[PDB]
């Protein structure tokens, strides 16, 4: 409020002015210039129109503050200093660029000053995708902009599930239209009648012809183009000519039995609600990359030599000479995780002088390098004194692409920084790490020298590979091999594939065009360290029939780094994958974006194009990559993608920045809640947070911003009375926000959010995602094991958001409620007390089915000890698990032992819970759920294998995924897996 800010006037004379905390630039600049005129040397001073403030932010970059409307606290200045200087630049570009930098947390001029040419070529080529996306965005403006800003929430299924088709009155849905048509905002009910096959045009026609009752051709047509359907209380809009059974609100209402809540909002009101978005070309796009190096050359297929790489020295290995004697730089030519040749090692030099100068030769010849070759430098040292036995341990690792964006072999002496060892890395190298030097300078750096040809050598275009494909072939089945191929196709991605079967696969490739499933196994059956084999496989992939997206995503994790294979997979994705299941699998594609060896390829183009044409997909894309700015291994690439998205996402930027700054400010709260407050029973136990949210500068930053967990949900006025903290896991935040719109009372009058710090909410998101795909499978195969994947979103380093479902209580909650107002019959009695009557047994049925949802789930995913606090039951009889965290093995069995209270509740409170009639029905639907998962377990292996390079401390390589492979029993047959589960569900009660 009294900050003494000094300003650098461009005449030279020095002024210092008091400034308020909430004061903006225009409020302080007027008296700044006034008392500057009062102070001497008022000669070069003139009006404020041609004078612009310049300062350096706390992210260490000077940036002009053209936007005069911004406050002092929004400046984020390391020192209270300003400068007054001529603009010498663009207005809108600089406000846009600062807003982009605030959305990332680091500015665009950091991208400007980095001299890696691949980064700037990426920044040039992303604007092609941006301009195509904004051209298709406004191709049918404002109609197409309506579907962009508020996306349809449709699935890819034109039909409907069979077991919910019988949940309605012969395919008919009773809705209520809450249309107002009133200057005095009077709300009213239109209970109204539709089938499911028709699109919303017949629905709005019926609403027109039924609205016109009690006061009675072209009128229906003109109201059709002026009315639109909106979900009450939440911002979903029914826009596109779709059969209306795919809208997730309607299907969720079918799930829960609640009637849908809709209305007829004016189309022009929605059009005026969404602002017109602007897309301007960047300043760096003025530069054209047309280089003429006055100094086309020969290719790889004319130069015949071996791969020779010379190691010069390390800058400084960060070791201790007292207990460590000798060090070495054992390398490896990798293709993802597969060594293309032997791991050629250096000499065992002492750590005192880390100098090698060793010309390591490799078994691979130069023409036989694959496109995605990855050298893996590793400083690892023998730190064990044993006789004829050396103990090895990694210290530094670093991957290097042998080909760049120019698609040429690396050459010449070059230094490169090395990443520190990951936590608990089993391998001595790092197969899964990304290629690139460490951005930090205080890490060990090492020198390389490739075979300097005194020229450039270029990997050829596909014409040469196409000709070599016809060349190498010159150099009607027995059905047993066909059924063998069918057997190979059904195997999981982690199948024990053999070279008998690999040689069978490679020797019969043109006969594998009949079945498309065999492709990823044929990925593993080829020798990438070959000349003819890679050409043959490229020729096959160029003519290979398209793939279902669920196993077209198989070609995307770390084991498949080939640009052509990943390009074909991305082509199959954009040809087949739909928006709802793209947003379903969006976390996995975000984590696949790490595995790209380059910056600009087809995957990033596809994900950007789908992100810049969809507010939901783009919003979740932005939040997923924003959650990983703390990961410096892919911070540059993901920061470039936040830069591109924030360039071409439109006015959501503002809303985005608001929630971002809200989250950032909220994150700051937890800092004072964690570092300053780490004790108990003080004067400021609860009063401090009440006073802090009573501060206008904090509470005003949490007003009117969209929910980060769902763009359709919007968050409004905060209730400080209904905000508190817990003492359950690590003191998270209970946050209550009233839904701003008037019709909020239909769905929920208040939105509750858990804000969690202290645990990584990234594996929890993955677990809840698994839960949602098992929901999809069980609904598709005809079993309504209704288990809820509550929304969870990580937003950075060990920080997350959880949306709260209400009317829920723990076992501890109901136990202490019963004790105050313990026995093994309290859960069943409480469920009697909540919903008795003719619905009660149905609720019990739900409680059985959701149990059959979770128990099997908690065995397949291997969740930890599910005690009485990390589980909650609803009022309508539905349980769900919350504290997932440690998943798969995570401690190296028997997860989620069926407790007694379950045996009371599923068995209707009978004393003999063992052989009730509903118990074998429970077991039968558990069996059916597991089998339905089991023929779809290939997708689960894919989805967990596309998460290896993420960075959870409990999912790194093929040491953890064997847990779900052994619980799902892909090695065993179906009946062996069945008896496996009769074993575990017989020892669940230790005898029953």
């Amino acid at each position: 409020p009294r900050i003494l800010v000094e300003c650098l006037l461009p005449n030279g004379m020095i002024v210092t002015l008091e400034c308020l905390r909430e004061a903006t630039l225009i409020t302080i600049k007027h008296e700044l210039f006034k008392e500057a005129r009062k102070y001497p040397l008022h000669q070069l001073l003139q009006d404020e129109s041609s004078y612009i403030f310049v300062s350096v932010t706390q992210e260490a970059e000077r940036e002009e503050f053209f936007d005069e409307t911004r406050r002092l606290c929004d400046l984020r200045l390391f020192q209270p200093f300003l400068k007054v200087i001529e603009p010498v630049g663009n207005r809108e570009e600089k406000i846009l660029n600062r807003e982009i930098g605030f959305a990332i947390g680091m500015p665009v001029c950091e991208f400007d000053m980095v001299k890696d040419p691949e980064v700037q070529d990426f920044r040039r080529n992303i604007l092609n995708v941006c301009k195509e996306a904004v051209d298709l965005r406004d191709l049918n403006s404002p109609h197409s902009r309506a579907m962009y800003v508020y996306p349809p929430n449709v699935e890819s299924s034109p039909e409907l599930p069979k077991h919910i088709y019988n949940k309605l009155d012969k395919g008919q849905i009773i809705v209520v239209i809450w249309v107002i048509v009133s200057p005095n905002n009077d709300k009213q009910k239109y209970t109204l009648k539709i089938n499911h096959d028709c699109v919303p045009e017949q629905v709005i026609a019926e609403a027109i012809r039924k609205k016109t009752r009690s006061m009675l051709k072209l009128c229906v047509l003109e109201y059709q183009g002026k009315y639109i359907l909106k979900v009450c209380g939440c911002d979903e809009y029914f826009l596109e000519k779709y059969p209306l059974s795919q809208y997730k609100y309607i299907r969720s209402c079918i799930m829960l039995g609640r009637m849908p809540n809709l209305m007829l909002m004016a189309k022009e009101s929605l059009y005026s609600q969404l602002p017109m978005d602007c897309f301007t070309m960047p300043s760096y796009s003025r530069r054209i990359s047309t280089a003429t190096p006055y100094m086309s050359t020969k290719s790889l297929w004319v130069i015949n030599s071996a791969l020779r790489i010379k190691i010069l020295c390390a800058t400084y290995v960060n070791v201790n000479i007292r207990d460590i004697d000798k060090i070495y730089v054992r390398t490896g030519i990798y293709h993802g995780g597969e060594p293309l040749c032997d791991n050629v090692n250096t000499q065992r030099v002492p750590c005192s002088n880390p100098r090698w100068n060793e010309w390591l030769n490799y078994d691979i010849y130069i023409p036989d390098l694959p496109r995605a070759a990855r050298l893996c430098l590793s400083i690892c040292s023998v730190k064990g004194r044993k006789g004829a036995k050396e103990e090895h341990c990694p210290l530094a690792w670093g991957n290097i692409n042998l080909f760049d964006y120019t698609d040429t072999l690396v050459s010449g002496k070059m230094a490169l920084n090395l990443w520190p060892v990951p936590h608990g890395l089993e391998d001595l190298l790092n197969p899964i790490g990304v290629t690139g030097s460490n951005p930090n300078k205080e890490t060990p750096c090492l020198e390389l020298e490739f075979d300097w040809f005194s020229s450039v050598v270029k990997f050829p275009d596909m014409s040469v590979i196409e000709e070599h494909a016809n060349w190498s072939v010159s150099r009607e089945l027995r059905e047993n091999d066909k059924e063998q191929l069918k057997a190979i196709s059904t195997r999981d991605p982690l199948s024990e594939i053999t070279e008998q079967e690999k040689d069978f696969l490679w020797s019969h490739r043109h006969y594998c065009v009949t079945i498309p499933e065999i492709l990823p196994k044929l990925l593993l059956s080829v020798k990438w360290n070959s000349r003819d084999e890679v050409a043959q496989m490229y020729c096959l992939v160029k003519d290979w029939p398209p793939i279902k997206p669920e196993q077209a995503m198989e070609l995307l994790d770390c084991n498949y780094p080939d640009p052509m294979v990943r390009g074909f997979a991305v082509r199959c994705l954009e040809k087949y994958l739909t928006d709802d299941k793209l947003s379903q699998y969006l976390i996995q594609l975000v984590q696949v974006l790490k595995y790209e060896q380059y910056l600009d390829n087809l995957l990033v183009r596809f994900l950007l194009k789908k992100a810049l044409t969809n507010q939901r997909i783009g919003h979740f894309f932005f939040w997923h990559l924003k959650s990983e700015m703390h990961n410096k291994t892919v911070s540059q690439r993901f920061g470039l993608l936040l830069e591109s998205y924030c360039r071409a996402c439109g006015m959501y930027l503002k809303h985005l920045n608001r929630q971002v700054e809200a989250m950032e400010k909220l994150i700051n709260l937890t800092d004072i809640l964690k570092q300053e407050k780490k004790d108990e029973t003080q004067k400021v136990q609860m009063k401090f947070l009440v006073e802090q949210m009573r501060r206008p500068d904090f509470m005003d930053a949490l007003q009117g911003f969209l929910s980060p967990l769902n763009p359709a949900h919007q968050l409004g006025n905060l209730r400080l009375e209904e905000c508190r903290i817990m003492s359950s896991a690590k003191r998270p935040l209970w946050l209550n926000w009233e839904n701003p719109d008037i019709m909020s009372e239909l769905l929920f009058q208040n939105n509750e959010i858990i804000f969690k710090n202290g645990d990584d909410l990234r594996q929890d998101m993955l677990t809840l995602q698994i839960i949602r795909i098992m929901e999809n499978i069980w609904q598709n195969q005809g079993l309504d094991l209704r288990m809820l994947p509550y929304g969870c979103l990580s937003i950075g380093d060990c920080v997350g958001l959880i949306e709260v479902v209400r009317n829920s209580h723990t076992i501890m909650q109901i136990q202490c409620k019963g004790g105050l107002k313990f026995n093994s019959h309290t859960l069943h009695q409480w469920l009697k007390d909540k919903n008795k009557g003719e619905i009660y047994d149905a609720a019990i049925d739900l409680f059985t089915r959701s149990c059959a949802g979770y128990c099997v789930a908690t065995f397949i995913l291997g969740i930890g000890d599910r005690h009485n606090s990390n589980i909650m039951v609803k009022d309508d009889g539905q349980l769900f698990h919350i504290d997932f965290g440690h998943f798969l093995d995570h401690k190296k069995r028997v997860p989620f032992v069926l407790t007694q209270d379950f045996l009371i509740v599923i068995s209707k409170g009978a004393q003999e819970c063992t052989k009730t009639r509903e118990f074998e029905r429970f077991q039968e639907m558990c069996y059916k759920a597991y089998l339905a998962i089991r023929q779809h377990a290939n997708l689960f292996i894919n989805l967990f294998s596309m998460m290896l390079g993420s960075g959870m401390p409990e999912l790194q390589s093929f040491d953890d995924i064997a847990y779900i492979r052994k619980t799902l029993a892909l090695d065993k047959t179906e009946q062996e897996a069945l008896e496996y589960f009769m074993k575990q569900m017989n020892d669940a009660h230790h005898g029953g």
Binding site: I14, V56, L340, E442, I497, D959
Partner: protein, 286 residues
């Protein structure tokens, strides 16, 4: 190294041999075949757990090449036809002859068994109480040392964040000095033709006042060089702290991983010896 010398009985016992390991999963066989050379092989019970499939994981080219042998009419072999009778004479024949008979691409014949009892040579004290006390003290040392290594990694992450934010603050000070020096050069360019005229008309009070508040600019740059110095000495000693903390985790990591290896091999020894968790789980469950 491998001593071999099983004996004159070539068709010996399947269950106890250098090549045999039984029903083992992919995790520990990947641990066994890691850091090996050409010709390193291992034969286990197959992943299907059927009647005598008995797959092989020969090491060649840095890859655990996963050979499967067949079980046609009670005979064994790499591929059809199965002209060889026993698996022991099969692996001895491939120890004597190359693999070019069935398929051409394989070059290495065989070099090094991974015996089950090579690790059993370094272990002793077969009696239950001695290994029980040894496993208890190994477990408590592993727990204390893993807690120490987790603390070391937390310190490493905290110091990395501290040094990164201090590096950004130092770069911010560098940018501030660049802006101040550019401003100083610019105002010298304007003021080299301004002060002497107002001298020439004969007044110096305005000049001494503007010289006084101009000296405030040099004063401010003087303390912010001081702050950059106190933050750069801070940066240097925090970088030294980061280096020595990395040296401590450098010392703590390798004995941790070999202690984990010995714990895993002791678990394998207890598994093959047949005694499951009876009394060891009682101490850990407290």
């Amino acid at each position: 190294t491998t001593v071999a010398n099983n004996g004159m009985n070539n068709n010996m016992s399947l269950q106890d041999a250098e090549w045999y390991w039984g029903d083992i999963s992919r995790e520990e066989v990947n641990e066994k075949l890691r850091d090996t050379a050409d010709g390193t092989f291992l034969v286990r019970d197959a992943s299907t757990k059927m009647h005598g499939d008995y797959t092989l994981t020969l090491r060649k080219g840095g890859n655990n090449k996963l050979i499967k042998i067949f079980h046609r009419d009670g005979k064994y072999g790499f591929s059809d036809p199965l002209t060889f009778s026993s698996v022991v004479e099969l692996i001895n024949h491939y120890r004597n002859e190359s693999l070019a008979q069935y398929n051409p691409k394989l070059d290495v014949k065989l070099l090094y068994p991974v015996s089950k009892y090579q690790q059993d040579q370094v272990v002793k004290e077969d009696n239950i109480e001695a290994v029980g006390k040894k496993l208890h003290e190994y477990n408590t040392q592993f727990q204390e040392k893993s807690r120490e290594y987790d603390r070391l990694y937390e310190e490493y992450t905290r110091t990395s964040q501290e040094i990164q934010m201090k590096r950004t603050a130092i770069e911010a000070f560098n940018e501030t000095i660049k802006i101040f020096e550019e401003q100083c050069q610019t105002q010298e360019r304007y003021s080299k033709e301004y002060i002497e005229k107002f001298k020439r008309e004969g007044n110096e009070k305005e000049i001494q006042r503007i010289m006084h508040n101009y000296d405030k600019l040099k004063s401010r740059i003087s303390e912010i060089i001081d702050s950059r110095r106190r933050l750069e000495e801070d940066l240097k000693k925090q970088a030294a702290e980061y280096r020595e903390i990395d040296k401590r985790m450098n010392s703590i990591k390798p004995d941790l991983i070999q202690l984990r290896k010995t714990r895993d091999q002791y678990l394998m020894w207890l598994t093959q010896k047949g005694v499951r968790q009876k009394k060891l789980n009682e101490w850990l469950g407290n």
